[PDB]
Structures are given as C-alpha cells and as structure tokens.
Design a protein around this ligand. Sequence first.
Ligand SMILES: CCCCCCC/C=C/CCCCCC(=O)OC[C@@H](O)CO
Ligand SMILES: CCCCCCC/C=C\CCCCCC(=O)OC[C@@H](O)CO
Ligand SMILES: CCCCCCC/C=C\CCCCCC(=O)OC[C@@H](O)CO
Ligand SMILES: CCCCCCC/C=C\CCCCCC(=O)OC[C@@H](O)CO
Ligand SMILES: CCCCCCC/C=C\CCCCCC(=O)OC[C@@H](O)CO
Ligand SMILES: CCCCCCC/C=C\CCCCCC(=O)OC[C@H](O)CO
Ligand SMILES: CCCCCCC/C=C\CCCCCC(=O)OC[C@H](O)CO
Ligand SMILES: CCCCCCC/C=C\CCCCCC(=O)OC[C@H](O)CO
Ligand SMILES: CCCCCCC/C=C\CCCCCC(=O)OC[C@H](O)CO
Ligand SMILES: CCCCCCC/C=C\CCCCCC(=O)OC[C@H](O)CO
Ligand SMILES: CCCCCCC/C=C\CCCCCC(=O)OC[C@H](O)CO
Ligand SMILES: CCCCCCC/C=C\CCCCCC(=O)OC[C@H](O)CO
Ligand SMILES: CCCCCCC/C=C\CCCCCC(=O)OC[C@H](O)CO
Ligand SMILES: CCCCCCC/C=C\CCCCCC(=O)OC[C@H](O)CO
Ligand SMILES: CCCCCCC/C=C\CCCCCC(=O)OC[C@H](O)CO
Ligand SMILES: CCCCCCC/C=C\CCCCCC(=O)OC[C@H](O)CO
Ligand SMILES: CCCCCCC/C=C\CCCCCC(=O)OC[C@H](O)CO
Ligand SMILES: CCCCCCC/C=C\CCCCCC(=O)OC[C@H](O)CO
Ligand SMILES: CCCCCCC/C=C\CCCCCC(=O)OC[C@H](O)CO
Ligand SMILES: CCCCCCC/C=C\CCCCCC(=O)OC[C@H](O)CO
Ligand code: NA
Length: 456
Amino acid sequence: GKTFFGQPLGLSTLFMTEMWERFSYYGMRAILLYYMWFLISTGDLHITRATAASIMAIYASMVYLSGTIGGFVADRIIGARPAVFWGGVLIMLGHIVLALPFGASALFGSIILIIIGTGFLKPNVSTLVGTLYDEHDRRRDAGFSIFVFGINLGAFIAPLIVGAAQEAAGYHVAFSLAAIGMFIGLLVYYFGGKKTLDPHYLRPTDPLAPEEVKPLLVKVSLAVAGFIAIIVVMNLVGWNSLPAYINLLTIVAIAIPVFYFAWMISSEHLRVVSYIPLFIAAVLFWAIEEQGSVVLATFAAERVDSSWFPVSWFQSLNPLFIMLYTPFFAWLWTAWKKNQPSSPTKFAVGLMFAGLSFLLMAIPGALYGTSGKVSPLWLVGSWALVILGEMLISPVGLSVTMSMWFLSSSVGSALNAQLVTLYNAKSEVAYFSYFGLGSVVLGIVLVFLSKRIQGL
Ligand SMILES: CCCCCCC/C=C/CCCCCC(=O)OC[C@@H](O)CO
Ligand SMILES: CCCCCCC/C=C\CCCCCC(=O)OC[C@@H](O)CO
Ligand SMILES: CCCCCCC/C=C\CCCCCC(=O)OC[C@@H](O)CO
Ligand SMILES: CCCCCCC/C=C\CCCCCC(=O)OC[C@@H](O)CO
Ligand SMILES: CCCCCCC/C=C\CCCCCC(=O)OC[C@@H](O)CO
Ligand SMILES: CCCCCCC/C=C\CCCCCC(=O)OC[C@H](O)CO
Ligand SMILES: CCCCCCC/C=C\CCCCCC(=O)OC[C@H](O)CO
Ligand SMILES: CCCCCCC/C=C\CCCCCC(=O)OC[C@H](O)CO
Ligand SMILES: CCCCCCC/C=C\CCCCCC(=O)OC[C@H](O)CO
Ligand SMILES: CCCCCCC/C=C\CCCCCC(=O)OC[C@H](O)CO
Ligand SMILES: CCCCCCC/C=C\CCCCCC(=O)OC[C@H](O)CO
Ligand SMILES: CCCCCCC/C=C\CCCCCC(=O)OC[C@H](O)CO
Ligand SMILES: CCCCCCC/C=C\CCCCCC(=O)OC[C@H](O)CO
Ligand SMILES: CCCCCCC/C=C\CCCCCC(=O)OC[C@H](O)CO
Ligand SMILES: CCCCCCC/C=C\CCCCCC(=O)OC[C@H](O)CO
Ligand SMILES: CCCCCCC/C=C\CCCCCC(=O)OC[C@H](O)CO
Ligand SMILES: CCCCCCC/C=C\CCCCCC(=O)OC[C@H](O)CO
Ligand SMILES: CCCCCCC/C=C\CCCCCC(=O)OC[C@H](O)CO
Ligand SMILES: CCCCCCC/C=C\CCCCCC(=O)OC[C@H](O)CO
Ligand SMILES: CCCCCCC/C=C\CCCCCC(=O)OC[C@H](O)CO
Ligand code: NA
C-alpha cells in the first residue's frame, strides 16, 4: 500500500540522506573558490588565483578517486551502514573546521576530511538503495531515478541557500550551514535507517578472510611508503611548491587508469583497446563539466553583471538543467524504438555538445571585448549545452564500459588542475575557442570510429 513514489519506504530515508549530503558538498563548492580569493586578497593565503583554481580542480579529482575506494572498505572491513554514518561525520567535521575562526591554515584539514568522508559515504548510500529491492524487482531503475532526483535537488538548492548566507552573514556562517546540512542528513539517516535498513549491512558483507589481512596490509603499506618516498625526493630536489604537489596528485590520478590500461592490454584484446577512445571522450567531457565550478565560476564573478544576486547562484544551473532534461530523455530513449544511437555515438555527440558549450563562451569576448561585463544568459546557454552532453554520455557510461568509468571523472578533474591555470581575461577567448574546438573535433573523430566500436 504505502510507498515513497511507488518504492519501499526506506528510499525516503536514503533520498534525504543524499539530498542533504549533496547540499553540504555543493554548498561548499559554490563558495570555496571565492573564499580562497578572499583569503588571498587579505594576504592570509599566499597563492595566485590560478593556483586557487587548480586546488578546486584537484580537490574534486581526489573526492572522485576516494569514491572508488569506499565501497571496498565498506564491503570488506566496516560495513555500508557505518561507512555512510562515519563518512557523514567526517564530512560534517570538514565543514566545521572552515566554520571555525581559522583562515587558510584550516583549508588542508577541511579538504582531507571531506575527501575521506565523501569516499566513505557516496558509493555506499548508493549501495544501500540497492539493498531496498529484491534481485527480481522491476522497480529498481525507477528507485534509483528517484534517488538521483534527490541528489540533484540538494545540488540545486545549496548554492541558493549557502551562497546567499555567505554574502549576507559571511563565509564562516555559510560553511556552518553546510555543516548543519550534513548534520540534518545524519539525523535522518541514523534514525530513519534503523527503521527500514537490513541489519545485515551493519557489518561487512564480504569480510576479510584470516589469510587476506596481511597481504592487504602489505599492499597499503607499500603504497604509502612509496608515496612518502616520492615526496621526500621531491623536497630534496627542490620540487616542493604547492603547484608541485598538485602536479604529483595529477600524475597519480592519471597514472592509475594508464596502469590499468597497460595491464589489460598486456594481460577480447580488441574490446579493451576500443574502450580507449570512449574513456578519453568521458575524461574530456568530465573535464569540461567540472570546469563549471572553476572557470565558469570565475567568468561569473569577473565578466558577468550579477550586481543584484549572489554570483555563487550560477552553480545551481547545472543541477537545474539535469532535472529539466531528465524526463525528456527518459521519454526519448523509450520512444526512440527505431535506429536509436549506439553508446559510442552518444559519447561522440555528448563530447561535441560539451565542446559547443565552450565555443559559445568564446563569443561574448570576441564580440564585445573582455574588459566589460556580459549577460548572465551566456552562462545559462553554456550550462544548457554541457548538460545536454551529460544526458548523452552519463546514463550509458557504466553500461558501455568498471572502476575506470568512475575514474573518468577523477582523471578529467586532474586534467583540469593543469588546464584551468591557463584561464584568465587575456586568454579567455583563446581558452574557450581552443578547448571547445578541440573537444568538437575529437567528437567528430569518435563518430568516424563509432561503427567499429559498436561492432566489438
Ligand atoms: C534539446 C535542445 C534544447 C536544449 C539545448 C538548447 C540550449 C542552447 C542554448 C545556446 C544559445 C544560448 C546563448 C545565447 C545568449 O547567451 O544570448 C545572450 C543575449 O540574449 C544577451 O541578451
Ligand atoms: C586532518 C586529517 C583528518 C584525517 C581523518 C581522520 C579519520 C580518518 C579515517 C578514520 C575513519 C574511519 C571510521 C570507521 C569507523 O568509525 O568504524 C566503523 C566500524 O566501527 C563499523 O564496523
Ligand atoms: C572541532 C570541534 C568539533 C565538535 C563537533 C563534534 C560533532 C558532534 C556530534 C555529531 C554527531 C551527529 C550524529 C547524529 C546522530 O544521529 O547520533 C545519534 C546516535 O549516535 C545515538 O546513538
Ligand atoms: C587523457 C586525454 C588528454 C587530452 C588532453 C587534451 C589537451 C591537453 C593539453 C593541451 C594544452 C596545450 C594548449 C594550451 C593552450 O593553447 O591554451 C589556450 C590559450 O591559453 C591560448 O591559446
Ligand atoms: C546532433 C548534432 C549536434 C552535434 C554538434 C554539431 C557541431 C557542428 C559544428 C561545430 C562548429 C565548430 C566551429 C569551430 C570554430 O568556429 O572555431 C573557430 C575559432 O577557433 C577561430 O580561432
Ligand atoms: C566525533 C563526532 C561525533 C561522533 C558521533 C558519535 C555517535 C554515537 C555513536 C556512534 C553510532 C554509530 C552508528 C553507526 C551506523 O552504522 O549507523 C547507521 C544506522 O544504524 C542506520 O544505518
Ligand atoms: C586514494 C584516496 C585519495 C587520496 C587523497 C589525497 C588528498 C591529498 C591532497 C588533497 C588535494 C588538495 C590540495 C590543495 C591544498 O593543499 O591546499 C592547501 C592550502 O592551500 C595550504 O596552502
Ligand atoms: C552536533 C554537533 C554538530 C552540529 C552541526 C554543525 C554546527 C556547526 C556550527 C554551528 C553554528 C556555528 C555559528 C557560526 C560560527 O561559527 O560563527 C560565525 C563566525 O565566527 C562569525 O564571523
Ligand atoms: C593511510 C592508509 C590507511 C589504511 C587503512 C586500511 C588498513 C589496511 C589493511 C589492514 C587491515 C584492516 C583491518 C582488518 C581486520 O579488521 O581484520 C578482520 C578480519 O576479518 C579477521 O580475519
Ligand atoms: C598507514 C600505513 C599503513 C598501515 C595501516 C595501519 C594498520 C592498521 C591495522 C592493522 C592491524 C592488523 C590487523 C589484525 C586485526 O586487527 O584483526 C583482528 C581480527 O579480529 C582477529 O582477531
Ligand atoms: C591522512 C593524511 C594523508 C595525506 C594525504 C596526502 C597529502 C600529501 C600531499 C598532497 C598535497 C599536500 C601539500 C599541500 C601543502 O600544504 O603544501 C604547501 C607547501 O608549504 C608548499 O609551499
Ligand atoms: C598506480 C601507480 C601510480 C604511481 C604514481 C607515479 C608518480 C611518480 C612520480 C611523480 C613525479 C613527481 C612530480 C613532481 C613535479 O612534477 O614537480 C614539478 C613542479 O612544477 C616543480 O616546481
Ligand atoms: C526563474 C528561473 C528558473 C529558476 C532558476 C533558479 C535559480 C537558478 C539559477 C540562478 C542564477 C542564474 C540566473 C541569472 C539569469 O538568468 O538572469 C537572466 C536575466 O534575464 C539577464 O539579466
Ligand atoms: C546542432 C548542429 C548544428 C551545429 C551548429 C553550431 C555550428 C557553430 C558554428 C558554425 C559556424 C562557424 C563560425 C566560426 C567563426 O565565425 O569564427 C569567427 C572567426 O574565427 C573570427 O576570427
Ligand atoms: C541541438 C541543440 C542545439 C540548440 C541550438 C539553439 C541555439 C541557437 C543558436 C545559438 C547561438 C548563440 C549566439 C547568440 C549571439 O551571439 O547573439 C548575441 C546576442 O543576441 C547579444 O545581443
Ligand atoms: C548549436 C548552437 C550552439 C552554439 C555554439 C556555437 C559556437 C560556434 C562557434 C563560435 C566560436 C567563436 C570563436 C571566437 C574566436 O575565437 O574568434 C574571435 C577572435 O579570437 C577575436 O577575438
Ligand atoms: C529538451 C527538453 C526540454 C529542455 C528544457 C528547456 C531548456 C532549453 C534551452 C534553455 C537555453 C536557455 C538560453 C537562454 C538564451 O540565451 O536565450 C536568449 C534570450 O532568450 C534572448 O532574449
Ligand atoms: C512547444 C515547445 C517548443 C519546442 C521548444 C524546443 C526548444 C529548442 C531550442 C530552443 C533554443 C533556445 C535558444 C534561443 C537562442 O539561441 O536565441 C539566440 C538569439 O540570437 C539571442 O538574441
Ligand atoms: C599514455 C600516457 C597518457 C598521457 C597522459 C595524459 C595527460 C596529458 C596532458 C596533461 C596536461 C598537461 C598540460 C600542461 C599545461 O598546458 O598546463 C600546465 C600548467 O600551466 C602548469 O600546471
Ligand atoms: C575546413 C574543412 C574541415 C571540415 C571537416 C570535414 C570532415 C568533418 C566531418 C565528416 C563527417 C563524415 C561522416 C562519415 C562518418 O562519420 O561515417 C559514419 C560511421 O559509419 C560511423 O562510425
Ligand atoms: Na552578485
């Protein structure tokens, strides 16, 4: 009888848990770059704005990378329900430390807490949604669609509420609101979950066997030791600026899939090779999409007349278009019975739309010059285009592909950590035109390659 939009009642709990976590996350993302600008302007943070942009990008990269690890830790060590709870606690702490009366000195600690916390929570709330359904339950896709609406809803309202709070009451109060958002999520999660969640998920479902503990320990220890060795050598040869560390994280984030690629190609060999263009297309798409909170956020603050509203509000456009497009594409893929495009073709076209979203942004500077301010509608059109691309590439991404798919966004963001340092008023038009055109061209290349990939 009683449901949450046709689904098991437990979905309401997880819906709200993620909505409020996404609220805390995207509330932070909407103001953190501006916060670093503020800390630079007061002389508390001694970096360039370019490096601040780089930080935003690599932050996102590590959050995504962390997400590829959290499922293992839940499934094999601590359980999905405690992963979500303690992940949320860590996330809340990460916002609290920025709410505290510190300055730049608290930034790194905040970032680490949220990287670890999001890694624990994000994959595992998704897992818990699955546990609501039997294997044979046809409602599963509908349920995840509803869950995703909650995600986007949280992403949508957070810049509005947290961004407004920031401009009125300051950054510390704004970060306190992010923390409170996660707290609300934890309250609903903790008390609601006890009502509907299977007790089974209080513990690992595939706990380490006795003989598995030592090898895992050796694996992790060697990884940490090597990473620390690299940092020691870096400091010895004088490569110890913040950009150097960001470069190290960039290399690590990119080396991970590259090593996977090199592994599989060495160790259906055709299939794996054919994924390379798809994986590259996904990386470049996520790169462009993830620049919304960095380069488009910069354009919004410097190049747009937003005198009458908080410029952080532009970050709401991304989840807004997702919500607006979704029922149309839901309809589209079911109504498109005859000659529906293949997944490789969807990637190509998706990459093209992302390219167009940047080519569009080259136009105001080319037409009006870069010294003035332009209509907010340029950014609206840009987000409209890139999200159109997301609708094509994202729903079939994991399908056509596993971890390397989830890694595509991490790698895209790591690429951004390098690229966004190139963006400024002098380079604006060339930046948008170059990377936009480059993306369209590779989209066109992928179209040429499409039939072969579809065959394999
Ligand atoms: C399924 C297709 C519909 C959804 C995607 C279409 C959205 C694309 C919009 C690109 C054009 C918008 C950019 C034009 C613009 O910014 O004009 C500014 C001007 O009006 C200043 O007053
Ligand atoms: C400034 C750097 C901060 C570093 C973060 C400190 C904490 C990092 C990792 C520990 C969190 C793991 C939480 C696991 C836990 O609470 O136990 C779960 C277990 O009891 C349920 O089976
Ligand atoms: C830097 C200072 C940090 C001090 C703040 C520490 C945060 C304190 C509490 C946050 C825990 C929220 C958990 C909400 C909840 O439902 O817990 C109830 C449950 O534990 C009852 O057994
Ligand atoms: C895993 C896929 C990697 C593909 C990355 C594609 C782009 C990579 C590097 C391009 C950087 C060089 C272009 C620099 C540039 O021209 O900036 C434009 C503007 O600043 C002035 O022209
Ligand atoms: C399903 C149809 C949607 C696919 C998108 C179709 C895109 C078609 C053409 C894009 C035109 C790219 C033009 C490149 C350009 O104007 O760059 C010039 C600029 O670099 C001058 O330096
Ligand atoms: C240092 C910050 C404050 C720490 C909060 C401590 C909260 C008190 C006891 C910990 C409760 C552990 C709950 C773990 C858990 O799996 O919760 C899930 C719920 O059962 C619903 O799935
Ligand atoms: C496999 C788990 C993922 C690994 C997480 C490692 C996270 C390490 C660094 C986070 C990247 C953030 C760098 C930005 C940064 O350090 O800013 C600090 C302040 O600017 C201090 O000057
Ligand atoms: C159960 C513990 C967790 C409670 C939820 C997190 C609450 C976080 C902060 C509470 C409100 C803090 C007031 C804002 C603040 O820190 O001062 C604002 C600035 O200091 C003034 O510029
Ligand atoms: C900065 C890296 C942090 C690494 C933390 C993960 C630790 C990795 C390996 C150690 C094993 C973790 C505990 C395993 C454990 O609880 O044993 C229980 C087994 O089920 C007993 O057979
Ligand atoms: C960060 C550097 C990498 C080292 C990770 C720290 C290792 C943390 C814990 C390893 C402790 C050894 C695991 C044995 C264990 O606790 O299992 C207990 C089982 O329940 C057996 O009764
Ligand atoms: C549980 C802690 C694990 C730490 C995660 C890895 C963090 C290590 C390197 C990532 C980049 C951190 C360096 C950021 C930083 O503050 O460097 C500033 C230096 O003073 C350079 O001026
Ligand atoms: C899955 C295996 C992952 C292995 C990661 C490989 C990392 C090996 C070497 C990292 C190279 C060190 C980067 C340091 C760096 O680029 O500093 C340059 C700065 O611009 C100096 O000012
Ligand atoms: C009424 C619009 C539909 C609901 C949007 C909720 C808020 C989402 C984004 C707000 C930030 C970007 C809006 C700026 C904007 O579009 O201004 C357009 C003006 O007509 C140009 O001056
Ligand atoms: C949706 C399918 C149709 C795609 C429409 C988007 C096509 C976009 C542009 C096609 C015309 C290219 C104009 C390029 C242009 O005028 O550049 C200006 C010069 O470079 C000025 O130096
Ligand atoms: C397949 C979906 C693609 C949707 C295409 C619809 C958008 C059509 C044309 C977009 C061209 C954007 C440039 C507009 C422009 O430059 O005019 C300047 C403004 O009018 C300023 O007065
Ligand atoms: C389907 C319609 C989507 C709208 C996107 C169309 C954008 C296509 C071409 C616009 C590229 C504008 C490039 C401007 C440019 O680089 O030339 C200007 C010179 O550099 C002088 O500033
Ligand atoms: C296909 C599913 C339905 C899509 C939802 C509608 C969103 C479609 C396009 C939104 C693009 C808004 C761009 C606004 C813009 O620049 O237009 C120029 C001004 O309207 C001229 O006054
Ligand atoms: C019954 C609904 C009718 C179907 C609407 C489908 C929407 C498809 C494309 C709408 C594109 C909106 C952007 C308009 C635009 O680009 O105008 C550019 C002008 O040059 C700006 O002055
Ligand atoms: C089989 C090897 C895989 C190749 C790795 C893909 C990474 C390709 C390019 C990395 C991006 C480097 C761009 C450098 C750049 O232009 O900006 C650098 C900044 O100015 C300084 O951080
Ligand atoms: C200034 C001249 C540069 C213009 C570039 C011209 C080439 C651009 C597009 C050619 C597209 C021809 C379509 C052929 C094609 O993709 O075949 C489809 C395959 O069967 C699908 O994999
Ligand atoms: Na404003």
